[PDB]
Design an enzyme around this catalytic site. Structure first.
Site, PDB file in Angstrom:
ATOM      1  N   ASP A  25       0.817  -1.217   0.000  1.00  0.00           N
ATOM      2  CA  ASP A  25       0.000   0.000   0.000  1.00  0.00           C
ATOM      3  C   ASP A  25       0.856   1.276   0.000  1.00  0.00           C
ATOM      4  OD1 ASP A  25      -1.768   2.053   0.495  1.00  0.00           O
ATOM      5  OD2 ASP A  25      -2.977   0.906   1.947  1.00  0.00           O
ATOM      6  N   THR A  26       1.040   1.858  -1.182  1.00  0.00           N
ATOM      7  CA  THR A  26       1.890   3.042  -1.310  1.00  0.00           C
ATOM      8  C   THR A  26       1.264   4.279  -0.677  1.00  0.00           C
ATOM      9  OG1 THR A  26       1.018   3.586  -3.508  1.00  0.00           O
ATOM     10  CG2 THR A  26       2.969   2.184  -3.405  1.00  0.00           C
ATOM     11  N   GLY A  27      -0.031   4.219  -0.381  1.00  0.00           N
ATOM     12  CA  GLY A  27      -0.709   5.341   0.253  1.00  0.00           C
ATOM     13  C   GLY A  27      -0.589   5.324   1.762  1.00  0.00           C
TER      14      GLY A  27
HETATM   15  N1  LIG Z   1     -11.800   2.575  -1.610  1.00  0.00           N
HETATM   16  C1  LIG Z   1     -10.858   3.512  -1.657  1.00  0.00           C
HETATM   17  O1  LIG Z   1     -10.557   4.057  -2.713  1.00  0.00           O
HETATM   18  C2  LIG Z   1     -10.158   3.939  -0.384  1.00  0.00           C
HETATM   19  C3  LIG Z   1      -9.955   3.067   0.685  1.00  0.00           C
HETATM   20  C4  LIG Z   1      -9.304   3.508   1.855  1.00  0.00           C
HETATM   21  C5  LIG Z   1      -8.862   4.832   1.970  1.00  0.00           C
HETATM   22  S1  LIG Z   1      -8.086   5.363   3.298  1.00  0.00           S
HETATM   23  O2  LIG Z   1      -8.328   4.484   4.378  1.00  0.00           O
HETATM   24  O3  LIG Z   1      -8.450   6.723   3.546  1.00  0.00           O
HETATM   25  N2  LIG Z   1      -6.574   5.311   2.929  1.00  0.00           N
HETATM   26  C6  LIG Z   1      -5.879   6.420   2.260  1.00  0.00           C
HETATM   27  C7  LIG Z   1      -5.085   7.432   3.080  1.00  0.00           C
HETATM   28  C8  LIG Z   1      -4.109   8.180   2.429  1.00  0.00           C
HETATM   29  C9  LIG Z   1      -3.369   9.143   3.110  1.00  0.00           C
HETATM   30  C10 LIG Z   1      -3.607   9.353   4.459  1.00  0.00           C
HETATM   31  C11 LIG Z   1      -2.817  10.400   5.198  1.00  0.00           C
HETATM   32  F1  LIG Z   1      -2.092  11.084   4.341  1.00  0.00           F
HETATM   33  F2  LIG Z   1      -3.645  11.217   5.817  1.00  0.00           F
HETATM   34  F3  LIG Z   1      -2.040   9.854   6.105  1.00  0.00           F
HETATM   35  C12 LIG Z   1      -4.587   8.613   5.124  1.00  0.00           C
HETATM   36  C13 LIG Z   1      -5.322   7.649   4.438  1.00  0.00           C
HETATM   37  C14 LIG Z   1      -5.842   4.043   2.987  1.00  0.00           C
HETATM   38  C15 LIG Z   1      -5.777   3.559   1.528  1.00  0.00           C
HETATM   39  N3  LIG Z   1      -4.354   3.334   1.262  1.00  0.00           N
HETATM   40  C16 LIG Z   1      -3.528   4.118   2.168  1.00  0.00           C
HETATM   41  C17 LIG Z   1      -4.384   4.167   3.427  1.00  0.00           C
HETATM   42  N4  LIG Z   1      -4.048   3.015   4.249  1.00  0.00           N
HETATM   43  C18 LIG Z   1      -4.569   2.932   5.608  1.00  0.00           C
HETATM   44  C19 LIG Z   1      -3.820   3.925   6.460  1.00  0.00           C
HETATM   45  C20 LIG Z   1      -4.447   5.064   6.953  1.00  0.00           C
HETATM   46  C21 LIG Z   1      -3.730   5.961   7.739  1.00  0.00           C
HETATM   47  C22 LIG Z   1      -2.388   5.717   8.030  1.00  0.00           C
HETATM   48  C23 LIG Z   1      -1.781   4.573   7.537  1.00  0.00           C
HETATM   49  O4  LIG Z   1      -0.475   4.324   7.817  1.00  0.00           O
HETATM   50  C24 LIG Z   1      -2.489   3.680   6.748  1.00  0.00           C
HETATM   51  C25 LIG Z   1      -9.081   5.684   0.895  1.00  0.00           C
HETATM   52  C26 LIG Z   1      -9.714   5.253  -0.274  1.00  0.00           C
END
Ligand SMILES: NC(=O)c1ccc(S(=O)(=O)N(Cc2ccc(C(F)(F)F)cc2)[C@H]2CNC[C@@H]2NCc2cccc(O)c2)cc1
Ligand SMILES: [Cl-]
Ligand SMILES: [Cl-]
Ligand SMILES: [Cl-]
Lengths: 99, 99
Positions: A25-27
């Protein structure tokens, strides 16, 4: 390997002697694993995004095996809907995005 | 390009003639953008995030440029921590994970 994104990029990992399925998960800033036991001290942390925040336990210096690549780093443990391998460990295995 | 993961993989996107910052997020199934005006009709969509499920607005066949690469596809609009380019559009631009 090269992994396409038609479906979730799930891999098998080994952590704390257990095999688990996890998402590359690059996000994700952090690596986040469903409830399990890990060795050592921990401290509480909140992480959040869509749907709000969850509380997790932060463990440091944890070894994880990801596709034959051993790496060490911080692992958060808590009620995540999906096991997540985040950037802190993806860097260690030399994972990049390419297009 | 080849993008490493030592920092968040943030890129510039163009949508509705405007430049925005967005995260290349292999963990996200979908592309989710902060509140903005998009053309056409929308349909309801439930997505599951780290904290739980929420409803967002789904717009189809939206033109979007990602790091200079053109995509046309589904964009969700809702409360998101950052603009997220998820797998649906990462696949369109030929983005893979490599290690
Ligand atoms: N169906 C979809 O398209 C959809 C699924 C899940 C998410 S999410 O949970 O918000 N999400 C994205 C994300 C992106 C950026 C941020 C930030 F920058 F604020 F830290 C926080 C969260 C998720 C999706 N991938 C990255 C993040 N993973 C969970 C997570 C959450 C928080 C901290 C972590 O270490 C990990 C977003 C979109
Ligand atoms: Cl770390
Ligand atoms: Cl590197
Ligand atoms: Cl799409």
């Amino acid at each position: 390997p090269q992994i396409t994104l038609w479906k979730r990029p799930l891999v098998t990992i080994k952590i704390g002697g257990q095999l688990k399925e996890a998402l590359l998960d690059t996000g994700a800033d952090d690596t986040v694993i469903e409830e399990m036991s890990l060795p050592g001290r921990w401290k509480p942390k909140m992480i959040g995004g869509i749907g709000g925040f969850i509380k997790v336990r932060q463990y440091d210096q944890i070894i994880i095996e990801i596709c034959g690549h051993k790496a060490i780093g911080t692992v958060l443990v808590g009620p995540t809907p999906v096991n997540i391998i985040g950037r802190n460990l993806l860097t260690q295995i030399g994972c990049t995005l390419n297009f």
